[PDB]
Subunit: 62 residues, 8 copies
Amino acid sequence: ASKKVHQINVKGFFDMDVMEVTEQTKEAEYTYDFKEILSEFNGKNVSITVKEENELPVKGVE
Amino acid sequence: ASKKVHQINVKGFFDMDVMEVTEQTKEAEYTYDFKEILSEFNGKNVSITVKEENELPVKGVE
Amino acid sequence: ASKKVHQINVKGFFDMDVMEVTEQTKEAEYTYDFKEILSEFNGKNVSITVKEENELPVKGVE
Amino acid sequence: ASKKVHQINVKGFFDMDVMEVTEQTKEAEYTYDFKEILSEFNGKNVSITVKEENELPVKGVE
Amino acid sequence: ASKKVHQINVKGFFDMDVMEVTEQTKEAEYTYDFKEILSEFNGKNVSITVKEENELPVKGVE
Amino acid sequence: ASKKVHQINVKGFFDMDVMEVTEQTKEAEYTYDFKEILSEFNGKNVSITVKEENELPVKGVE
Amino acid sequence: ASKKVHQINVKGFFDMDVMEVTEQTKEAEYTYDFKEILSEFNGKNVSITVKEENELPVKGVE
Amino acid sequence: ASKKVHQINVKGFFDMDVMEVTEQTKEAEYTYDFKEILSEFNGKNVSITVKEENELPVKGVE
């Protein structure tokens, strides 16, 4: 069960055209290039997760 | 706190050149194209996780 | 193990008569119709969870 | 933080027309009526979760 | 896997002599009697967890 | 955030009269006396959890 | 499944030369000696986790 | 929230004298040297977790 784990978490607005993820913090607006990140993993067994969560359509605010 | 979550989990051998992930099950060897999967999210806020876990270098076996 | 997950979380005061869940936010009072939400899943395999948590009967506040 | 939690987990094939969830066990096929279950919570604050997970579209099995 | 779970969480200062647990909130000091709570479960299969966490002995402060 | 945690997990059939918990393993049938266990914590802030999970009333096996 | 767990969590700047971990709280600067802590476990089956998390190299701060 | 995580998990019999952890798998007996592992983190903010879990003292085996 012993193992070495290496993981990258990236949260932000995704633009696959320029292949970049950019998050709007409370101070700035950071931009990470998913391409470079992804490449660090090219050639190996990985576990990739892509989550997108939105709001629930309401039917009435009071 | 109510929300609608949509998530994709993909585990397998990653080849970013052809942009495909392929896992070796006990029964068959499935191949998913990360490109198509990724595109379903292009243009929205996301969390991407990319995990890669290996074994620990030993020094004694018996 | 690769898969596509789609999940809906709804937290609020439940009224099964009108089939609606409504949560009280420190800014407003949203109302979601559990019927419409539930219907998005009609006809498929699902894990459903319904939690209700209350307070513990005390034997002395101070 | 002390509290009393009461929760119901139901996993199966969902039919909202007859309002029943039915899971296929390697020993039998159980059927629960979501209506009765849901009613045990009518009139209270609740967190409800509805998950539906499917497979990932492949581009080549082998 | 479908099931009905019923759980009690109780956090506070424990006195087994009078069999009572009492927590000091920011607003008030609640007192729950572990005896009554425990009895609700007498006669059934359970999981009991009892956790106690303290601070780590330091050796340098600045 | 550094801390020392000490925790006890006890799963089995609960009998508060003789104050003992007894689990039926695959080999034997172990019996732990909740009294002794509980006492190790008498006099300190703790987080106690008592869970009891049962099966869901069915309406039809096929 | 019943068991007694004993666990130590230590978060801070690690210096293996003097074998000490030191975290910078919003108040003080605590220093724990990993040596003493580690010794409390010498001679036992353990599980050890060492995590180090950094920031993601950006390409566009704004 | 985006970040790079690097984590090591080590489970086995701990000997701090020789500074080695050794686990007994269902096949072999692997030995890892905690010293080398630990050094990979010397000089960094880390989180360290050391857990040791034992069995509960019974009062009636059967």
